[PDB]
Subunit: 103 residues, 3 copies
């Protein structure tokens, strides 16, 4: 198992490509994105998107978060949070030695 930070970004759908570009410029090895509905305090739910990015370091997750927020969160609704995770399998994330290599 390889330690990882799971960075979650929930924001307005129109920022999809802009945020993907930031994630791709970060060094991150991938991301997953999904459609969601969002309410923040006539249905009032709006369409949003949620990105999930697993990063090897906490610093990379914060860089992505910081860059997204500083660029867009003055003007667009969003939330960014982080969860601890462990990657058990992931050719790209762990490399070809796998996620439980020794040393």
């Amino acid at each position: 198992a390889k330690p990882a930070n799971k960075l979650v970004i929930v924001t307005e759908k129109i920022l999809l490509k802009k945020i993907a570009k930031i994630i791709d410029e970060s060094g991150a090895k991938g991301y997953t994105v999904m459609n969601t509905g969002g309410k923040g305090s006539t249905s009032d739910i709006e369409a949003n998107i949620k990105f999930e990015i697993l990063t090897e370091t906490r610093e990379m997750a914060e860089e992505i978060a910081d860059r997204v927020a500083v660029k867009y969160f003055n003007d667009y609704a969003g939330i960014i949070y982080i969860c601890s995770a462990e990657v058990l399998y992931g050719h790209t994330f762990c490399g070809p030695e796998g996620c439980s290599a020794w040393s």
Copy 2:
């Protein structure tokens, strides 16, 4: 980074508005909801997943308790909680920001 409990509610799609109403009455700052599936009690049956970030464990438990008592003896559902830290979130962290 502000500690948060991430409360997840997975249940029947027909309960969407009813659960949202509970989350809106709770003081929670917001929620996300998505369409998901599972095999269904009966190939994949559509259901829904709510994610609510709460500042306290007690708020997450109050929501969970309310939803579960009101609906989960009559409808299928699971509620669980994960630890998260919010880095950014104007509404969640307030104007003081997430140094909380």
Copy 3:
């Protein structure tokens, strides 16, 4: 609250039924699946799938992960990771005595 491991499997949509079968054979008490995207090997977004499975033990989650990866991950793209969670309500996960 009952401790749980949340196993997450993100992989190619064509594997949906095959991975479900492995989860069903594992002893796991359920799963949720959703439609997601990633950038794709080729810009814009390629459809894929995400499974979330809550397991009572860490070893059951790893058994599922090991069976999926060995069987499919030399030939199909995927990532499997695990988060700690606590189940607050879940008739199937916790049994009729409740999550405590």
